[PDB]
UniProtKB/Swiss-Prot annotation, chains A, B:
Protein name: Defensin alpha-like protein 1
Subunit and interaction comment: Antiparallel homodimer; disulfide-linked.
Role summary: Intestinal defense peptide. Has potent antibacterial activity against Gram-negative bacteria E.coli O157:H7, S.typhimurium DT104, and K.pneumoniae; and against Gram-positive bacteria S.aureus, methicillin-resistant S.aureus and L.monocytogenes. Remains active in the presence of NaCl and Mg(2+). Probably functions by disrupting bacterial membrane integrity. However, does not show cytotoxic activity towards human intestinal cells.
GO biological process: antibacterial humoral response; antimicrobial humoral immune response mediated by antimicrobial peptide; cellular response to lipopolysaccharide; defense response to Gram-negative bacterium; defense response to Gram-positive bacterium; disruption of plasma membrane integrity in another organism; innate immune response in mucosa
Keyword set, alphabetical order: Antibiotic, Antimicrobial, Defensin, Disulfide bond, Secreted, Signal
One annotated Gene Ontology cellular component of this protein: extracellular space
Tissue: Specifically expressed in small intestine (jejunum and ileum). Probably expressed by Paneth cells at the base of intestinal crypts. Coexpressed with MMP7 in small intestine.
Family per record: Belongs to the alpha-defensin family.
Domain of life where this protein originates: Eukaryota
Subcellular localization, as worded in the UniProt entry: Secreted
Positions spanned in the full protein: 57 to 87 of 87
Chief subcellular location: secreted
């Protein structure tokens, strides 16, 4: 329901970019 | 500076969550 941490930070367009923080650039979400 | 990786990862609501990653020490939205 939320994204936060201190590792790898990736963002994706979505009305205002999306926030995904994860060790692996895996598909966090499909929506 | 701006949204970067390998530092601090933070996010905030804005129609679909926003992506804000920084090394802190600066005022970024702060919700």
């Amino acid at each position: 329901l939320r994204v936060r941490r201190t590792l790898q930070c990736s963002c994706r367009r979505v009305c205002r970019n999306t926030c995904s923080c994860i060790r692996l650039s895996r598909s966090t979400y499909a929506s």
